[PDB]
Amino acid sequence: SSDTQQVQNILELEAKIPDILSSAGKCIEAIQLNNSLEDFRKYSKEFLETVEFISTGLRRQALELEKAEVPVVSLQPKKRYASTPLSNLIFDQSSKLI
Amino acid sequence: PPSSLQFSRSQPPESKESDATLAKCWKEKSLTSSCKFLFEAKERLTSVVE
Amino acid sequence: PEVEEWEANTLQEYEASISSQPKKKEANDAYQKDQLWDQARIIFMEERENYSWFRQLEIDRATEEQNANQMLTDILSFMKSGKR
Amino acid sequence: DLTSIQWRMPEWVQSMGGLRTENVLEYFSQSPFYSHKSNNEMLKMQSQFNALDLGDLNSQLKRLTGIQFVIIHERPPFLWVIQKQNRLNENEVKPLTVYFVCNENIYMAPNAYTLLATRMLNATYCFQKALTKIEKFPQYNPQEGYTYPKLSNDNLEENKNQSIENADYSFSPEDFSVVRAFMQSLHSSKEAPDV
Hints:
The structure is cut from a larger assembly and holds chains A (98 residues), B (50 residues), C (84 residues) and D (195 residues).
Chain A: H1 4-14, H2 16-32, H3 37-67, H4 84-96
Helix pairs in contact in A: 2-3
Chain C: H1 2-20, H2 27-50, H3 56-81
Chain D: H1 10-15, H2 22-30, H3 39-49, H4 58-61, E1 67-70, E2 81-87, E3 93-101, E4 106-108, H5 112-132, E5 139-141, E6 145-147, H6 179-190
Antiparallel strand pairs in D: 1-2, 2-3, 3-4, 5-6
Protein name (chain D): Mediator of RNA polymerase II transcription subunit 6
InterPro entries (chain D): Mediator_Med6, Mediator_Med6_fun, Mediator_Med6_sf
Family (chain D): Belongs to the Mediator complex subunit 6 family.
């Protein structure tokens, strides 16, 4: 778990959310089309975990966002003047011209 | 000047049975609209995730 | 008039359902089904509480910063004097 | 059907020399709302037979229990209130639906709940229509807010305030600018000679 990896973990969370719609619409459908209280007991029993796991997953990922201690405000960059790769790059072209 | 209206104690009066059918017909359509709504929203949100 | 027009649009199709389903009334069954809504809602309410819902050590991190601060006072006193 | 519907026989009322007291009840007899079961009917029969055996109205009505249409109130020469009732005793009587002469016209008195709930119906229906017209229209995107797709832009010219300070040199739309000011300065200027 580092840098981008948590973001990828968030990708795992991403698939779950939209379905929460149809699942609810599935639950009602059990008392609707299926006309069955028991199957509604089932899918309603399933439906809540989509809520709980995602909610707790967010609260915990955010807690990770605090543990990482990434600053609340983006830093203003200095006008970077001479990272080495830029230097030996330009030098490389210099020899390339020579 | 107001107070034109005045009390009149006269019957509930009564209601047609078909209205009871309307009570069902409205609600069932509303529920179907509910399911279609949730499903459609899942669709467009799935595309948004895409 | 548009509302009652819609009402005729509802009754025409309910009576159309009556045409497709002559002697098949289900409102009586719909009563106990409404009772099913009544039970399902209660079970739905009670079930949610079963699930979990929302660290002082992070508060203690402030105490860490505190002792770090007093430690800063100590070291500045050292640079001032060499006292330990 | 026997509710808000209008009814009138103006030639009749014009023929009567204007409504008085009994003749307006006769106008109620003219009305479709009038009941054959009414005590006024059998009393009318009594006038056809006994004739003399009549005593004003209420002295004749109150002692004869049944359907009635007593004139509790009146507004000559315009309105005439006529409360229906059902006598049971020398004292007891059930109040019933008002009928009245709405200037050579008769309307039953509406129930309060029926029309309050009617207006509530009209309002909630307007609300349903209000929702259905705009559903499937806020083209949402978390990245881009609630987009509303359009044939073209202007027309008119959360806490996401964070950005790099100086920015410059940089880029940031500025998707569009001043182009509206082109033509609008042009039309503000076209009226300038007029000004």
